[PDB]
């Protein structure tokens, strides 16, 4: 059960993540901020589900809440992915067709796994999908991380579990209905459609790094060109809801059949009408067909 | 950077039920109690963990929290709750063999009242108000200093069903106002009154003591049904017998009055935990 904390690989308002050693193997140890205690508990409820386990979902090892006197620590222990997040990976590396499709199909596979109920594992909507919440594995596939905001639904019992977490999604990735706060809060389909919007943005971030005809774009986050650094909720609402902005499709993509197919797919994630957006299953099937 | 010693040696099993098991364990020399939950009772681990993630209760008469642990296994999730270890065991265990004097009886019941009032009271700045919902002598531990602490917040409510033998009449007749937090406090007070009866029987006066018996031992079977309890408590309106010998002893006379005021059919007539404490501080 003993763990050695070896180096900090991330620190923010969320808390910190450490590379640690456990029985000679690297593990990731997240120490939550007290400010985010409700994410720790939610992530623990989600990882209680044995049938959540999947090659494209960050592997769970343990969760602990420890306390003496008035001090509490909140720990999550997972698999460790040395290559880091997709956000990290894309900064420095360009992609060929095979690697670009492998990445985006693996994320689609993880998301369809979350969204589809197993009769068990409830249907799950993530609510904070972004490139920092995706890890790159040594086999070139990715896995989805951070289930602290997740919503669960059971079709068998008609039960929607939205949890108790005042945390909201990463502002840059928020869907129009999240930014204008018109999202139907008691509708499970609404949360799936928020994930699809964010998936489209991650598809765009990845596709920019795929080389075609000797051309590639630099890594940029969604809406880099239209909002201030460290954008506020209102900054995002302006560009997405008032200005109706969507990420620009570089014209060089239209010379490449793969990037042309991906541009089509990301536009079907970005409809202002949530019910028009593709399902995660349809995205997975479309990416399985694209060459 | 730092070693995080998580190894707990499980040394002996001190409890096995439908809930799972409790073990005496060791962490880094320190004695701990480890409750390993059955799959049947996972929601009790989640509720106690959610409560402690909301408010880190620290009180001499509340079983001391150390850790909640979830570990992924091949094909299951393992759920452990780690607490302080009280080697003298539960009040239920303790009363079977031990008799009490006036000072030890009062110290036991005032320590319980103290833990219960701590749960019940909202503190601003603090803690939400908490009702226990399964108070009984098996959920109270005896400490070496003669005070008790309250255990098991798996059914707690902040502002599984309770043990049937200890259910208040409004729970048995399903009239409890479930939207009203004070209703849950009044259910705990009923159960406290039954625990006070269990303890008072074991207090010696004029060379006499009663044998340990659970509440309603004379009118319901072992593992009484909901119906068995409803008929006794709601339809016939029976209450535990106060033996004549108590009325020769000023302490037991005062405790009989106190437990009567926990057992009113009308929940709003019952004493509060704070008023029980004050009454107990004025006895002897
Ligand atoms: C979970 O339980 C037990 C834990 C420990 C334990 C082990 N290492 C470190 C600590 C610790 C050090 C420092 C801080 C604080 C102090 C300053 N503050 C402003 C912020 C940080 C908190 C915690 C503890 C408490 C020991 C125990 O028993 C001896 C425990 O009980 C079984
Ligand atoms: C998103 O969320 C969670 C992630 C992880 C996690 C797991 N493997 C590896 C990592 C990682 C390692 C290394 C880097 C490098 C990248 C580039 N380099 C310049 C700096 C550092 C980045 C990331 C992480 C962060 C664990 C979590 O919990 C334990 C997470 O929370 C659920
Ligand atoms: C994850 O799991 C378990 C962990 C432990 C445990 C073991 N050593 C040290 C610790 C510790 C406490 C507190 C800090 C502080 C230091 C100061 N800083 C400002 C904040 C952090 C660091 C380390 C813990 C919590 C025990 C366990 O069992 C008794 C665990 O398993 C349930
Ligand atoms: C009620 O609930 C919980 C209780 C405890 C707990 C804590 N200290 C000591 C005990 C204990 C030790 C020893 C004996 C007996 C063994 C044989 N003989 C009769 C002598 C004595 C009984 C009891 C327990 C059971 C821990 C819990 O969680 C970790 C509990 O759940 C919240």
Q: Where are the domains of chain B?
A: 1-87, 88-284
Torsion over CA of A256, A260, A265 and A266, rounded to 10 degrees?
90
| Nearest atom (ligand 1) to Cα of A66 | 1
DSSP reduced 3-state for A152: strand
Classify residue A158 as left (phi > 0), alpha (psi -120 to 50) or beta.
Answer: left
Q: Which residue in A286, A290, A268 sits closest to A278, CA to CA?
A: A268
Phi, psi of A71 (to 5 degrees): -95, 130
Resolution (A): 1.4
Method used to obtain the model: X-ray
Sheet of B3-4, strands arranged across: B3-4, A3-12, A15-22, A25-32, A71-79, A60-68, B65-72, B77-83, B30-37, B20-27, B9-17
How many alpha carbons lie under 13 Å from residue B97 in its C-beta half-sphere?
Answer: 5
> What is the distance between the alpha carbons of residues A87 and A93, in angstroms, rounded to a whole number?
11
Chain A partners of B76 at a C-beta cutoff of 8 Å? 50
Distance A279 CA to ligand 4 centre (A): 51
Candidate list B134, B152, B188, B249, residue with the active-site label: B134
* Residues ending a continuous segment of chain A before a break (C–N > 2.5 Å): 119
CB contact under 8 A, B42 and A61: no
CB contact under 8 A, A64 and B66: no
A152, A274, A275 from A187: Cα distances, Å = 11, 12, 12
Helical axes B273-281 vs B250-260, angle rounded to 10°: 170
Chain A and chain B share a number of CB contacts under 8 A equal to: 77
CB A144 within 8 A of CB A111: yes
Token digits of residue A138: 């040594």
Token digits of residue A152: 């669960």
A61, B100, B202, B244, B245 from B208: Cα distances, Å = 57, 11, 9, 11, 8
Q: How far is A225 from chain B (nearest CA, A)?
A: 41
CB contact under 8 A, B65 and A67: yes
Q: Which residues of A are catalytic?
A: 128
DSSP A111: H
> What is the distance between the alpha carbons of residues B208 and A86, in angstroms, rounded to a whole number?
77
| Nearest atom (ligand 4) to Cα of B15 | 25
> What is the distance between the alpha carbons of residues A54 and A284, in angstroms, rounded to a whole number?
15
Q: Tell me whether strands A142-144 and A3-12 are parallel, antiparallel or unpaired.
A: unpaired
Distance A218 CA to ligand 4 centre (A): 62
Token digits of residue B284: 């002897």
Give the residue numbers of the binding site of A for ATP.
9-17, 30
Residue ranges of chain B whose CB lies within 8 Å of a chain A CB: 1-8, 42, 46, 49-50, 52-53, 56, 58, 65-72, 75-77
Query: How many Cβ atoms are within 10 Å of B18's Cβ, its own excluded?
Result: 7
B68, B88, B104, B141 from B14: Cα distances, Å = 19, 11, 25, 13
Q: Which residue in A42, A49, A10, A47 sits closest to A28, CA to CA?
A: A10
- Tokens 């048995």 — which residue? B172
DSSP reduced 3-state for B273: helix
């Amino acid at each position: 059960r003993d763990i050695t904390l070896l180096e900090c690989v991330g620190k923010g308002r969320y808390g910190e993540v450490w590379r640690g050693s456990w029985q000679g193997e690297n593990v990731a140890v997240k120490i939550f901020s007290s400010r985010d205690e409700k994410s720790w508990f939610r992530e623990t409820e989600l990882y209680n589900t044995v049938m959540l386990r999947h090659e494209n979902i960050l592997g769970f090892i343990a969760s602990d809440m420890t306390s003496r006197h008035s001090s509490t620590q909140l720990w999550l222990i997972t698999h460790y992915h040395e290559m880091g997040s997709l956000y990290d990976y894309l900064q420095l590396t360009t992609l060929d067709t095979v690697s670009c499709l492998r990445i985006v199909l693996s994320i689609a596979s993880g998301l369809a796994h979350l969204h589809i109920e197993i009769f068990g594992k409830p249907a799950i909507a993530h609510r904070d999908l972004k490139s920092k919440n995706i890890l790159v594995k040594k086999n070139g596939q990715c896995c989805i991380a951070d289930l602290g905001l997740a919503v669960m639904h059971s079709q068998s019992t008609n039960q929607l579990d939205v949890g108790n977490n005042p945390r909201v999604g990463t502002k840059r990735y928020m869907a129009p209905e999240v930014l204008d706060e018109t999202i139907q809060v008691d509708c499970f389909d609404s949360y799936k459609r928020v994930d699809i919007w964010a998936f489209g943005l991650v598809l765009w971030e990845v596709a920019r790094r795929m080389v075609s005809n000797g051309i590639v774009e630099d890594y940029k986050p969604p809406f880099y060109d239209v909002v201030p650094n460290d954008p506020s909720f209102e900054d995002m609402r302006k560009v997405v809801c008032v200005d109706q902005q969507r990420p620009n499709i570089p014209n060089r993509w239209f010379s490449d059949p793969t990037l042309t197919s991906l541009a089509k797919l990301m536009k079907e994630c970005w409809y202002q009408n949530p019910s028009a957006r593709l399902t995660a299953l349809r995205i997975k099937k479309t990416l399985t067909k694209i060459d």
